[PDB]
Design a protein around this ligand. Structure first.
Ligand SMILES: [Zn+2]
Ligand SMILES: [Zn+2]
Length: 57
């Protein structure tokens, strides 16, 4: 079985899920330069910065 009971991600492969499930931990080095939230990938980062939240670049 490989379906996150939280998000519902579908990853028939372990490495894919095994990693996903481990993300619900604290393995997110990508921390926003303002909030206290973080992500496991740099992609989501840009997604959180592109928003008009707080990025007076
Ligand atoms: Zn999940
Ligand atoms: Zn932020």
């Amino acid at each position: 079985k490989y379906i996150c009971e939280e998000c519902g991600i579908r990853a028939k492969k372990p490495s894919m899920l095994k990693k996903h499930i481990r993300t619900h931990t604290d393995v997110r080095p990508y921390h926003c330069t303002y909030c206290n939230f973080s992500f496991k990938t740099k992609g989501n980062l840009t997604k959180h910065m592109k928003s008009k939240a707080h990025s007076k670049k």
